[PDB]
Design a protein around this ligand. Structure first.
Ligand code: UTP
Ligand code: UTP
Ligand code: UTP
Ligand code: UTP
Ligand code: UTP
Ligand code: UTP
Lengths: 297, 297, 300, 297, 297, 300
């Protein structure tokens, strides 16, 4: 919805956004939105996501697809009306994204998803990319385990020429929807085949906001069309993890919230048995330095 | 409609257009059009805006969407007939833009929306853009608060990978329509995802004229496809706010009206707590200097 | 229709075309076609113009849109049949352009629309363009007033981010149709969004010059310069005349196609601003194709 | 249809093709095909031509459009079956081009259309083009009158911003069809707007063969997308008339028949009153010289 | 169908493929497939070819088009089922190409079509192309007569601005189908207008295999979009005849079979009366030399 | 489906993936999936593959096409529901790929298909490509025979101008589906016309590697190099292994993805021709991403 501000309410918002990353208990936002989803009446649509054609499929709180849902309208606080209708397995009225309010007035956050190695990590979409010899697949799994912490991480597999990999985009969005509905830490391997269908364009534009609203992190590998990789990394990701000149070393660049500073830190990594990667255990980065990082792609 | 002029009536028009920016009380036009909208008979369509497909949705004076409206014709002063019909939630007959006359003979104005720091600002669309380290999001919010003055400004959020951000274009145009119907100062963060669908093309072509007719200002962030950013900044904006070589410094370029001089002034800014930006408190700019400014993108 | 010529009838045509620009009373063609339109029986379609989709809408002599019109055929002199039918507000049979004969055998003219400052100006479409600091909007209004003379000029506004500007293409073509049906001197500000492409926009660029020249009205259209080459081609091939800014501030070059197969003429305009940016225009030489291309190169 | 040859029948064909340009009385082929068309039973389709959409409209021998025609099949000499059906003003079955046989075994000719100034000119399509100051419109009319000889030439006007010019492609193809059905010498001013719709592509590919089969000449002005002008001039024209370095001077390049030599000669011209051009009163040209000529465009 | 091999059966296949070009009596394959076609039961579809739209038309053994054919299934040796159905003059079920088995296990051949001047020539598609002054049209007719030998060659004419030339693609594919059904040596003048519709793409991809399966040769002129000419010449042709630096001289490059060596030889030619060309009466060429030849286009 | 991991279960997966290439008996995965397919109830859809239009056709375990199949749902372990429905010969509900579970928890493998000349070879798709004089067609047949071992290899022929070659894409996908359903070693000659693009062709390039790796069969496809970059990306991202010609005639480099997140391995092949162009292949080192890109650069 739209929000109105004066100087005082705006300052309060920025303080709350800052807290949502810097001082909230890691993973608190995820637990909060889990409660909101759990409170939703049975059969109510909670999430719509685009399929390959640009139509949208709709899910309930238990990640079960809704095939039929009678037109139903809800008036928001700002006066806007949201309508939802599902017919023959597809959204007839509504919008892509969360169909229930997970955020309220607290918008524009990068809710802290986890803390690891003395660094806080944001929810939203994290694109893992770069050139050179440092492998992306081992990194995304290492990050998934690390941010998972006490919890297991969920793996969505797509579009690689290996056993058991789904290559159908419509199954992919079903997997992603279920993952975000049920898990705080999600790995996607890989985004190569989405990088173009209306569904693929929708996914790139929608997923970061979907994840940040939920308070889950989606860690997606993307091997570098090159300008679309750059723009997805620049504008569609909440955080970026990019390989450097030095083997095993990665740079993490985090958007900490709406209008807030982008932060950076470095990761050192090494391989153990069967290529299992281990990540070893604040500085601001400006826009010109950010573009300098993107040039390496 | 079409308008006829001789030398004397043309000179009168230019004098009135000049006054609409330079000497009218700031925000007076907005208050005038609010009165016009308030005088509209119950149920009457007042605004049509394009959705993603290129179809148009229609709103009444209270920013409520009209789903059904029997064909109704109105003869204008020049002899032209405007017809409006709405069926199944979509415009069947009519045009995009204001469906009631807010302007009359007084067309081609950039009605003054506010005065701040000794400078007058125009209604219409203001694109906030540029390269370098000066942040666009903090600027648009600072400008929104400043031009809001005694009034709160409205924030429309779109297409960023942060919590609570809508990423569905059809919700976006609903938000924008409501904002322009109800508020003098509007911030859009951001225009990145519109920059292509018929709806997106319609919005870029329509919004400046819609806002200027209302006397509201739409302050839109746009991070630089590059030629589309240049043309939107060159030809679709009433004013442009562009970052400079010096950190914190911005140049404001204002179209003051039809056939009138483009003016320029500079803004100095600084950050306080939680990245809240403060803007610190006539010279003509020619077309070649304007192009020189656009080259920096 | 098609026309047949031998040496003698061709020479006569060229003499008549030459006269239509050089010696006819300025604005005489417009008055003639006004009479033709006024003589048309009530309810008869006179003009069809393309909307955004590429369908065509149809107008009667009073610039009122025709919604329903039973199929009706007319056999021309060359043996061809023109059919007109309108159903549900759209042309079902017919063609874009004038649906009644305004011209007869006298085709390929640039009928003189006005004389100002010792120069004759052609009807048809005039594109006002160029680079540099000389403003196009003040020029089109100055030219509109000047060629209007004793008469007011009509202003069609389209696609600028200013108060009261229509930005819907289908309203735009309605405005243009009405303007050409009712006025000799017409200003369009601006053509930017038509060049910004729909079938309707393509139709308009291809149709408007011939429509205006047939009527004997002048359409003075501002156009600020893939896209640049379309501005060049519209200026090169879709305009009856071109007014282009020069190196010197306030100075413009007017390039006029005087008729079918006839010489393109050129002259210069000097201008200055008064109060509230009102521009005043201050008061024969042939230009060849290579010089014409040299002028178009400046649009880069 | 398909034709079978051995050495002896092939040599006979080449001799007949050579004669069709070099020794037949100028305009004889046109008179022959006029007789063939005149012999066609009343109401029979004789010519189909593409409209803008790529559908085809159909004409009888009197250049009257056929709106309804019951399916009718004709078996050719080679065993092939040609079917023709027209429904609701459009071809339902058939092909673009001549729907009756004007040529028989005598195919691949450039039938002589006229002789002027000691040079024979071919029927088919003649593209008049080039750069520089020599005007194309005066040339096409001068050539039309000259090749017309004792007969008037027909003028088809299209796509110029001058009084009485048709700009609707579907009227254009109607004009062209009627012209070719009724006249030996035809001028088109101009081909600029065809140079893209399916109809325009069809016309460029069809018109030369249509005209050569009839024995009429279509003299078309084409101002130079540039590569499409080159290919139309190279491959879609029976003859080319191109301006040179010297003002008033033109080069005529003629395909004299299937597998036969391309010939060249020069024209000198001058203007009289009201820009009426007068043309003042064998050498082979090879493919490399032909390409050299096309480079000048 | 699919075929299974071990070392011994593979070696046998390669020996048979080698023989099909090098040692079989010239034209023997054509006579064999004529027998196969003649043995087909009355009314049975034997050949399907794509029309402009990408639909397919269907022919019987007598080159008569089939308009209606009830669904009929045939189980192949590998277990696959081929179904054929024709409705309203178009293929409803089936595939493009030969609808009866002309080859059996003997696949991947370039069956010898003729011997002339001490050189064997392959069936399939021969593209005649190149730059320079050597004419393609006279060459294709000279080659047609020469390879025809005791038999007349068939000429398919398409897309040139000369008398009697068909320019409608759907008539073109009808001509080609009939030619391949009834004649061993076929000339196409020319392929310029096919070089894009689905039908044109189908034809370029299908014709070589169609011709090689039949044992007929299709000799097609193609004047050089340039990369499409290169790829058609590189990958869609069984043999290539390309002009050289020396006037009248041509290089013939022949694919002799699946996985077999490409051979080359040179032709010398001269003109007699009315431009009738006479061709005057083993060395391997590698891929790098082949690309060197293609660069000349 | 989605899979959940902690450190311990992830380490177990990587160990199992490593084993699936390095230590499992060659061809064991193929035999396992043959058993799974054989156990499927009569009439059950097992494989869906895209036709030219982007619709999908569906096959049973005997490689017979299914024309009609009533909607049928199956709930997976992760909670997801897979639905399959076939109407009028086309998939109405379902997904492209294997419609029965051949893999279970054991995903992301490159199951060893064969061992030859002291080297293990992966199932999945192998693209055979490169520039220079070394012929691709003889190589794919030599590799087919070699990896076939005791078994014959299947040859799918497509899009070459030679006798008996199918050139219809929909027949091609039928051939490929049958081949993967019935044979461990498959040769495709050639992929040129799929790269020559339809939705079906795009689907095939994106689907075939995963289909083959899931089955444990190897698809050995020749591909001769806008278009060049698509050959590079297909070779880079759509292939389980790559066999590319080198500077030296007869010599090839084999680059193998050994599994999800595992090392890419490389070795060289020497070859020579016998009679009638029959090629014979004569009888671990890791390759990094920068070296891999260096190899791909040679395709220009
Ligand atoms: O022990 C190992 C294993 C793997 N790797 C390296 O990590 C990579 C992980 O395996 P991938 O094949 O997934 O590579 P990637 O994610 O970097 O890029 P794509 O191929 O998916 O586009 C492998 O390509 C390998 O080079 C190591 O450096 N050490
Ligand atoms: O205290 C602060 C906070 C923020 N900033 C700067 O302001 C920017 C505002 O945050 P954004 O991430 O919105 O940057 P932006 O609007 O310029 O561009 P997008 O990424 O949205 O396209 C941040 O990127 C940061 O560099 C400061 O300079 N100081
Ligand atoms: O007094 C004046 C007023 C205006 N001008 C100049 O005339 C121009 C007329 O006003 P516009 O803003 O319309 O500029 P334009 O027509 O040249 O081009 P667009 O922006 O419409 O594409 C303005 O851009 C201004 O620079 C003057 O030179 N002096
Ligand atoms: O007496 C004359 C008349 C005309 N001309 C020249 O002949 C041309 C014929 O008039 P056009 O305007 O038709 O020029 P064109 O055919 O060469 O090219 P387009 O403008 O149609 O694209 C004119 O443009 C003029 O330059 C002369 O050289 N002498
Ligand atoms: O006696 C002759 C006749 C013809 N020729 C040459 O042979 C060519 C055959 O006539 P074409 O015009 O068909 O040339 P082409 O096939 O090479 O190319 P297209 O224009 O058809 O695309 C002619 O262009 C001519 O140059 C001779 O060298 N000597
Ligand atoms: O004995 C032989 C036979 C064949 N070859 C070489 O092997 C190649 C195999 O025959 P192909 O003609 O199939 O070549 P290719 O597979 O390399 O590429 P495409 O043409 O299919 O795109 C032939 O091109 C030939 O040069 C030899 O080097 N020696």
């Amino acid at each position: 919805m739209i929000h109105l501000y004066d100087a005082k309410s705006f300052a309060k918002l920025r303080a709350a956004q800052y807290a949502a990353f810097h001082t909230d208990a890691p993973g608190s936002w995820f637990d909060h939105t889990s409660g909101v989803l759990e409170s939703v009446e049975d059969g109510t649509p909670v999430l719509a996501i685009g399929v390959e054609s640009g139509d949208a499929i709709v899910f309930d709180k238990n990640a079960q697809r809704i095939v039929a849902y009678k037109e139903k309208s809800v008036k928001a606080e700002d006066g806007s009306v949201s309508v939802v209708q599902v017919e023959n397995g597809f959204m007839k009225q509504g919008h892509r994204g969360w169909l229930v309010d997970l955020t309220g007035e607290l918008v524009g956050c990068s809710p802290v998803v986890a803390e690891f190695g003395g660094h806080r990590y944001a929810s939203g979409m994290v694109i893992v990319t770069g050139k050179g010899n440092s492998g992306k697949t081992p990194l995304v799994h290492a990050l998934g385990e690390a941010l998972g912490g006490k919890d297991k991480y969920a793996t969505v597999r797509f579009g690689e020429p290996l056993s058991g990999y789904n290559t159908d985009f419509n199954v992919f969005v079903d997997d992603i929807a279920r993952a975000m509905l049920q898990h705080r830490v999600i790995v996607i391997d890989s985004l190569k085949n989405v990088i173009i269908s209306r569904g693929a364009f929708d996914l790139l534009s929608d997923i970061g906001a979907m994840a940040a609203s939920r308070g889950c992190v989606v860690i997606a590998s993307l091997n570098p069309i090159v300008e679309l990789v750059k723009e997805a990394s620049r504008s569609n990701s909440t955080s970026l993890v990019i390989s450097t000149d030095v083997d095993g070393e990665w740079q993490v660049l985090t958007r900490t919230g709406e209008g807030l500073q982008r932060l950076t830190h470095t990761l050192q990594t090494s391989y153990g048995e069967h290529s299992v990667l281990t990540i070893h255990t604040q500085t601001v980065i400006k826009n010109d330095e950010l573009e300098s990082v993107l040039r390496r792609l």
